[PDB]
């Protein structure tokens, strides 16, 4: 049950429970609920120092850290046991040199559908991606989908959600370009063909769950997040280049968390702009960000003064 | 041929340990926010590097008390000489106009 103002300090009644949480995507997650004020009780798998910076977010006494190996069964099913809402976003990009990367993304969020679905929680919520298609791409972009449907047996109402690509403040997607100072800016490939996809900014994602997570009568009823005004082009590799103007790793350096000569080069031009018959954001309101007015502040390089802004992009066409 | 070899060994270990702390171990792709800050512990100098007066007159007068030590400087190989009267007499003349130099710009110099 809810009390007073909702500024910090309150109840609000909630008691979430967020896995991963340390990522771009999961960490920006926790702030807006350690505002309202909840006992978002957040599990890390191995890191104490890193997980350091999420500590002034929840009052005092809103969050609690557990450690958790995830295929172990009962590791996670000590923390689900007082809940109210579950979300989960765990998960990586390339497969590791210990892990298997096939059932990590199938029995795995199904050891988080285990007695967590029985022992009484509710609005339990997985993540997709607009690309994630069981057509023959990619070894990550597929087994994401096996994820979408080997995972949607159990729990046969969740609100699934399938956000956008996202473009950020600390993120990978837009900041594996520019970071191409290099001997040479090569496109993918040397095409500007379906350049470019929705880049929704972070804020309305963290915001269309926050909308959600008492939304009432979202369950089942999965959403597509709508992006930007409005597809995009090629300029847009252009576009930043043009305002730029040209965690628990180790200790020394990790030698291996690469750029994946891999179908990393091909895991983001796949598009497959997918049904917009989904709801998808708008009706999970309010929220509608372009990327010409928050483009300016990410991107970051040595002039670190002198923009003088004017770069921009008609809509593109197929708008 | 060694002496060259003496500090082509002395350089290369120099340049080694250089690029084995800001190569190497170093590569901030993490969060590492390189925003606004670094600013040498301040914040924005709108400002340029104005003249100081009193700091450029260090460096000219200098430069004129320099060249004459290098006349004074073959003064050990002028002892084995033949005519000796004409060595000192000579050696003590640059020593006294280095000294006037100082008297007329000692009646000026200001805050230095
Ligand atoms: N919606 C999108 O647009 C989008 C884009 C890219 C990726 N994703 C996927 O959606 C989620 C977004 O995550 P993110 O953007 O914050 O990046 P992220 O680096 O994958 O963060 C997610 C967390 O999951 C942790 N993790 C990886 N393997 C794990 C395992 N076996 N057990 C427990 N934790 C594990 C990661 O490291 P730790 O174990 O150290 O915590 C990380 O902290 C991820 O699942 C990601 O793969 C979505």
Redesign the interface.
């Given at each position: 049950i809810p009390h007073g103002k909702g500024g910090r300090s309150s109840v609000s009644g909630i008691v979430a429970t967020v896995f991963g949480a340390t990522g771009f995507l999961g960490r920006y997650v926790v702030n807006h609920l350690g505002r309202m004020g909840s006992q978002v009780i957040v599990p890390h798998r191995c890191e104490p120092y890193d997980t350091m910076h999420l500590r002034p977010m929840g009052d005092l006494g809103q969050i609690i850290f557990m450690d958790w190996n995830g295929r172990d069964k009962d590791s996670i099913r000590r923390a689900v046991e007082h809940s109210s809402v579950v979300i989960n976003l765990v998960g990586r990009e390339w497969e590791t040199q210990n892990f298997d990367f096939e059932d990590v993304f199938v029995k795995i969020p199904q050891a988080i559908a285990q007695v967590s679905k029985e022992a009484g929680v509710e609005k339990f919520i997985h993540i997709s991606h607009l690309n994630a298609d069981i057509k023959s791409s990619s070894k990550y972009l597929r087994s994401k989908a096996v994820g979408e449907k080997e995972v949607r047996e159990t729990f046969p109402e969740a609100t699934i959600i399938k956000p956008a690509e996202i473009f950020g403040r600390?993120d990978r997607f837009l900041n594996y370009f520019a970071?191409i100072r290099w001997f040479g800016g090569v496109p993918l490939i040397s095409l500007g063909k379906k350049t470019v996809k929705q880049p929704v900014y972070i804020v309305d994602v963290t915001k269309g769950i926050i909308n959600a997570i008492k939304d009432p009568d979202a369950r089942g009823k999965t959403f597509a997040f709508v992006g930007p005004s409005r597809y995009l082009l090629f300029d847009l590799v252009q576009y930043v280049f043009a305002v730029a103007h040209r965690?628990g790793?180790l200790f020394?350096?990790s030698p291996f968390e690469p750029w994946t000569t891999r179908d990393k080069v091909e895991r983001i031009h796949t598009t497959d702009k997918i049904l917009p018959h989904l709801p998808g954001l708008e009706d999970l309101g309010v929220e509608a960000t372009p990327l010409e007015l928050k483009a300016i502040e990410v991107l970051?390089r040595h002039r670190?003064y002198r923009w003088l802004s004017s770069e921009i992009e008609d809509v593109q066409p197929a708008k | 041929m060694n002496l060259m070899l003496a500090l082509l060994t002395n350089f290369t270990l120099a340049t080694l340990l250089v690029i084995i702390a800001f190569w190497?171990?170093?590569?901030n792709?993490?969060?590492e926010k390189?925003?606004?800050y670094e600013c040498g512990f301040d914040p924005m100098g709108s400002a340029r590097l104005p003249f100081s007066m009193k700091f450029f007159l260090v460096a000219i007068t200098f430069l004129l008390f320099d060249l004459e030590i290098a006349l004074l400087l073959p003064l050990p190989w002028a002892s084995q000489t033949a005519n000796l009267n004409t060595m000192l007499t000579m050696a003590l003349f640059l020593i006294i106009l280095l000294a006037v130099s100082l008297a007329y710009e000692w009646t000026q110099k200001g805050l230095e």
């Open positions: 600390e970071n965690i790793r020394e350096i970051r670190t | 190497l171990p170093q590569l792709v993490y969060s390189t925003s606004p």
